[PDB]
Symmetry: D2
Subunit: 363 residues, 4 copies
Amino acid sequence: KLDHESVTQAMQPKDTPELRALYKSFEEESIIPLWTQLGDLMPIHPKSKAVPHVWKWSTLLRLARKSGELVPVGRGGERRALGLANPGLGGNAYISPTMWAAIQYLGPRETAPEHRHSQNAFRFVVEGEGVWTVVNGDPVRMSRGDLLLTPGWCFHGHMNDTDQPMAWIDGLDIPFSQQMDVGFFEFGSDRVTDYATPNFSRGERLWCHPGLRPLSGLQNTVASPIGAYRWEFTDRALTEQLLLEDEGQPATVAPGHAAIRYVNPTTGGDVMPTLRCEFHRLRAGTETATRNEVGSTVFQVFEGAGAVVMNGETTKLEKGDMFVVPSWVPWSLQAETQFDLFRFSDAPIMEALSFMRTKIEGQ
Amino acid sequence: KLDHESVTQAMQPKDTPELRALYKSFEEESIIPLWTQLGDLMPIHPKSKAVPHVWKWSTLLRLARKSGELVPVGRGGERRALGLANPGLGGNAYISPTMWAAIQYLGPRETAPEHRHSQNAFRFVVEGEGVWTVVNGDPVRMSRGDLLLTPGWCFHGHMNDTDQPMAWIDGLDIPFSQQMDVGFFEFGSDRVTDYATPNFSRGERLWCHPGLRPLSGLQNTVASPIGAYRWEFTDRALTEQLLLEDEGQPATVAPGHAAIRYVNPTTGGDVMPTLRCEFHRLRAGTETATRNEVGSTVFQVFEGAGAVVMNGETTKLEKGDMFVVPSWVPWSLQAETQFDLFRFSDAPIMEALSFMRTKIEGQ
Amino acid sequence: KLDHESVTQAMQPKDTPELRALYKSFEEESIIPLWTQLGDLMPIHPKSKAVPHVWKWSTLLRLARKSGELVPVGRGGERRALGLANPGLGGNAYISPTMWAAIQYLGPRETAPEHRHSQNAFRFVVEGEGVWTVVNGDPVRMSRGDLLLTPGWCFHGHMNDTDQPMAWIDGLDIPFSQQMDVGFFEFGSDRVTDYATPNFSRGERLWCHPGLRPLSGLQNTVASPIGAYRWEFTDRALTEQLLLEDEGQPATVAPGHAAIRYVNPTTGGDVMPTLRCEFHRLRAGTETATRNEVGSTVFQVFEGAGAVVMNGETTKLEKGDMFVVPSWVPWSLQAETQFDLFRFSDAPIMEALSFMRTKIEGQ
Amino acid sequence: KLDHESVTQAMQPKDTPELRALYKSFEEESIIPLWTQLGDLMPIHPKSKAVPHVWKWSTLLRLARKSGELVPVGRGGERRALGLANPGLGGNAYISPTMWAAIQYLGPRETAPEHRHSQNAFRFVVEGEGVWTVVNGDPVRMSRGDLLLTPGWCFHGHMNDTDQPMAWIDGLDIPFSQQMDVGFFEFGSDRVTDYATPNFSRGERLWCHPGLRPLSGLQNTVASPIGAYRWEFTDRALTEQLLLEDEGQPATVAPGHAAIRYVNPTTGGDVMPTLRCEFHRLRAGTETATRNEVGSTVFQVFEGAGAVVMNGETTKLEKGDMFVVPSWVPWSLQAETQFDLFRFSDAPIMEALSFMRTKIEGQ
Ligand SMILES: O=C(O)c1cc(O)ccc1O
Ligand SMILES: O=C(O)c1cc(O)ccc1O
Ligand SMILES: O=C(O)c1cc(O)ccc1O
Ligand SMILES: O=C(O)c1cc(O)ccc1O
Ligand SMILES: [Fe+2]
Ligand SMILES: [Fe+2]
Ligand SMILES: [Fe+2]
Ligand SMILES: [Fe+2]
């Protein structure tokens, strides 16, 4: 089938003074013709400006740690968060066209003051403890393996209750929101509104009992009311899938590939309107079938060792390393040991708007 | 406002030979005129043929136990289940116009053979253990406080793995299904297809991790894929609600009234298309506000002591006792000690069809 | 596969004084055992008490006309409507277990006073004119071929603006509503609230422009806000389908079988929560493939000549004749001339509750 | 309340060699810190790079006409479409961050060859006739006042059947699709696949009968199957609203302001997943209340004379003139004569993702 390089170009006008005058009037009148731009504007398949890229956790940690020494956290700058900037996205602090990802660092006894914004956000922890994030006044402990949510427009601030630093990753729909013009922002309290440090938040104490819904929470929500998806449950779910597979029972998405989607328990859908969160566990030796998927995804290695292949290029990966797969880039994971990864993506956007497509090798 | 007793009856024809001949032709031609039937067919508010009624657990147990002595369980009759028959429903084995409820009794080492039917069903246990119910080949342990589901068209049979008898209650949409003509039925295996007795079923091992969904289970279901809602989770959820109330935090539906709805985790909706299951826990001294609700509900006392008021009549209640509240009958619960009750209803039917109405005293 | 007649009956207790005493205690305690009732309560496939039956329009007209002479219309009896009573439904004025159908007759200058009720209702006209039905104060002309709606809880009354009588058919969910206990009813004005007789109602003037929705009507409704589905549109739609078929283009449901569903334009779904309305037009010679469908349906012949086959029995049909197909009864239509039929059913109930099943001969 | 200009900037590190070295390592490692970017990335309310702007139809026509003389239409460039480029969007052929708008010109007997692409598209006509657009093989006449749809992935080409030129406007989600990486594109036939010029398309002959749905079209669609929303219906709907207002009846969105939304008749929702189309008619003298709305909108004056106010600035408008209102820009319309406008927007994106907000003056 023809592409933009092989098709006949039948709209090539004669290069005369009249043509050049027409084209000068276009500039003056804020007009740009489709016929000179077609192939750029409307590619055969997606061709992102973002490139696949890997950031090493050892490098992220060094830069975050040095930032903890040299930059105080507080009002204005709001957070000591270091955004991952895709080399292909022109100097914008965007890991992909839709998503922001950052390593955030909070030192001994620091607080990061309360604010809210339309942009949706989550926190994920490969390692560490000591921080509580207070979401609409509800303190939520942050620990290794936990997904924490802060849906758009919820007040949130954080405090380190400890004499030891903690780091984690943030994901937000900042780049989508900046480009599409949906951002609103409000400064809240200079200190978190509750310094208490309970083991479990009020949201969890209501919503984290499997298959049960409070009669006071019968209205569905656009975002999950669960503030913490704790490691204990994620680990148990993934283990049970591999055990069910051992027993000859359906459960894994693919052979030796256990995986869950974190969900809004009021609907069974995605945690937030713009962001999908998953967790994958591959047995030693597993090699996933190559996928092309519309929209972008980011993974963080939680545990074990393995590799990612993107555009045919293998990169070895270790605990904490992060990678981005832009739209339609062919990708696969290869597990050396048992290989655990946290994943996020802009797939709820693509699916809501009927733009999603998937190609899987061998099917 | 006028009712059918106080309105003028302006369609009263002269009682002549011609009128009586007209009315005889109506009988011959299978015609029945609205004008002689209006008030019956279309009441001012619902007036059920079912009456409020209470069955004592001590009486249910005696009859079930004697049935265990005198009647063998097996093919044909299928189950040793004793249906609660509303005195107002003309000899039909219906607790309400929509619902069947029964005490079922399975003796030492008995099996009840496998079958399936379009009618949706659940099991609830106030006391006992030893039985496994095998649902589409997945053995599901039955224990005190557990809700077990068997959605329409799932093969199910049960076996007592023990030398001791067990009793439980069944709820089904049998009366709805019989009157509306939606019943299909298929005999399966004469013995259960798996005699293994695991602590937890495969359904639970996949689906009972709070806020997590397997990537192999991304299609929504019409009924919950959770085969067991275990007492441990229900008890914890209800306790946390009362604790949150202690802490000044929203959670209970009403003061001292904790309550959950069992839900399909794929949608956040009801367990099955025709049947809603809830569990309520009232602090000692709680008296619920009087409700009128369209459609019928049945409760079983799980624990504690208290009373129900129906149509203004108080009946004292004990562990295991069962009562039915027909459509639009005013009802309230009064808790003497801490008072725990399992509840089921036909409310998903009423709500699906936009017939639901609720009146709550003092609001 | 086994049925209830061929299965072994393994729950047959020894007929002793102790057994008979047990069974007497069951009666005293309002208990009815499943084992003596199983096959009745839970049939292999639906076996309705309703039977297929045909009512002749010439007979309906004679009885309605005589009723117009002998019975005045007004308060109390409310409407001069003659309900079609299924011979199998025990003297209940029910055409099926879910639906009421009636021929209603309004003589010269009569009014039928305003009321409302939870039961949903529609009017269909095989022939006649002169009546306006005033629905929540909006006068809606009634003419040949028109479907008129009156969703539950809308005030409605009717008046004949003419010196000539008119007859039509009513359909309601009266039998569903009576058996399920969802009926509420309120008397309104003794006269219609607006005697004006516009050609088109306000509802239609807002809602009957194809593919357009008023910005003041962006909230979805549970029932259609279109008060009249006029013959002109139904006829044009059916004709265009047969023309598209002539042109080799997809459109008809089956060869020579044009058909539409009347829909709620806010959702694209059924006109009312409990009732589905369709209109079918078959070319001369068309014989539809035999269907078994869960739930009941009623047709009225609008025009042309043909036959229905039910349970293998052929009945010839003429203009106005009405027939009922109970749940799971095999049925087919045979067209002698071009054959037009209006159809209603309880299918939205069956589909909402996941009870629908369909068997089509040759597929 | 604080904004980014008035808040204290508490994250200002000491400008030392160590800090500058840290910041150099950030560049080297593709890291950009939040603390230097916060206010840009996360504004108090949306602050688009797009600016309000007006393009005159007389200018668009001159440039399109000259393009018809100097540039041939055909393969490669695909369409002689002149995109409206927002002065604030850096040289991108985008009228807003989400939407493309263009004047397209097709001369006597020209054809524009068939292609398809994931990007959704529509055509609107302020004036002219003679072109047919062939959509998945179904020829759709284009005439004054018509909205034509071409949902993503439908093959489409166009041909002028006449010796006279025609111009119209195109709207697409090109800028959304380019930035979010969802574009796929396929070249089809070099000539349209059907040169026939029927008055009405097959889609319309099936789908444009108010409140009726073909039994062969019971599956819902993500986009409307109506290929043409003809002027006749839009005009009648708007007139009826103003008449109902005359009669004291609810209908208009605001006093003297009639308006419709073009809808997908299978769902009652928007025509396509990314684009909302409306048509407004204001009585002489009407001044709409000032709105701020999230996301962008574009209007074209269809008929009459009036003005738009954006950011407090009044611009007088005539037949065919086009304007863009970027996200959150305050806007109002003022009608001198009776004032008719076609409107499109990215609102289905904002609403699907829960980003929509609206401020209306005086409420
Ligand atoms: O609230 C946060 O911690 C936050 C973290 C980020 O990386 C970017 C924006 C934010 O608002
Ligand atoms: O499958 C059962 O245990 C069952 C129990 C009942 O009480 C009634 C019908 C049934 O099919
Ligand atoms: O309102 C009516 O015309 C009506 C007609 C019927 O056949 C039965 C009940 C009703 O309320
Ligand atoms: O198909 C079209 O006519 C078209 C028109 C545009 O203005 C831009 C892209 C397109 O594909
Ligand atoms: Fe934040
Ligand atoms: Fe059963
Ligand atoms: Fe009525
Ligand atoms: Fe195109």
